[PDB]
Amino acid sequence: TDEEELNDYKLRKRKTFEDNIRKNRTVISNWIKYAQWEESLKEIQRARSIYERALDVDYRNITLWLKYA
């Protein structure tokens, strides 16, 4: 049950961090730490959409744009 524990760990972390960004839609540390956690997986086609919907609530900050760039 290695795949079960792997998907369980990833699903718990994704659910906790999606509840975190659902609770606070202002501070931008949560989206960038979640998206760099997916960047640690090194093969993603979904983290670009995360940075794309993370700049809709705040496009005036430099940190999110420079980190995604």
Binding site: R22, R53, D56, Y59, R60
Partner: protein, 49 residues
């Protein structure tokens, strides 16, 4: 050419479909360029003030 009439809605009906959905707000209108004044930084001491 075809014929288009309307079915009569009887006035003995509650609202049929559950209007209780809640989604997060989507992407808004796309951001215009921001075009402020040239941003300045004061000193090392007035920031300490």
């Amino acid at each position: 050419v075809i014929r288009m009439v309307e079915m009569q809605k009887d006035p003995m009906e509650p609202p049929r479909f559950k209007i209780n959905k809640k989604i997060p707000r989507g992407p808004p209108s796309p951001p215009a360029p921001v075009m402020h004044s040239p941003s300045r930084k004061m000193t090392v001491k007035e920031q300490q003030e």
